[PDB]
Amino acid sequence: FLPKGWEVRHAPNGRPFFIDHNTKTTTWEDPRLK
């Protein structure tokens, strides 16, 4: 359900940080919510 190279991983703090595995970019916000 994600864009190519996008991750939804939950850090040990219990938060899902969405990684862009293409351009090495990271964001807490979700492209799916848009």
């Binding site: 991750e7 850090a11 940080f17 969405f18 990684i19 862009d20 595995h21 090495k24 990271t26 964001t27 807490w28």
Partner: peptide, 9 residues
Amino acid sequence: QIPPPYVEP
């Protein structure tokens, strides 16, 4: 607030 990158492709 910085989110950790990816290690695994």
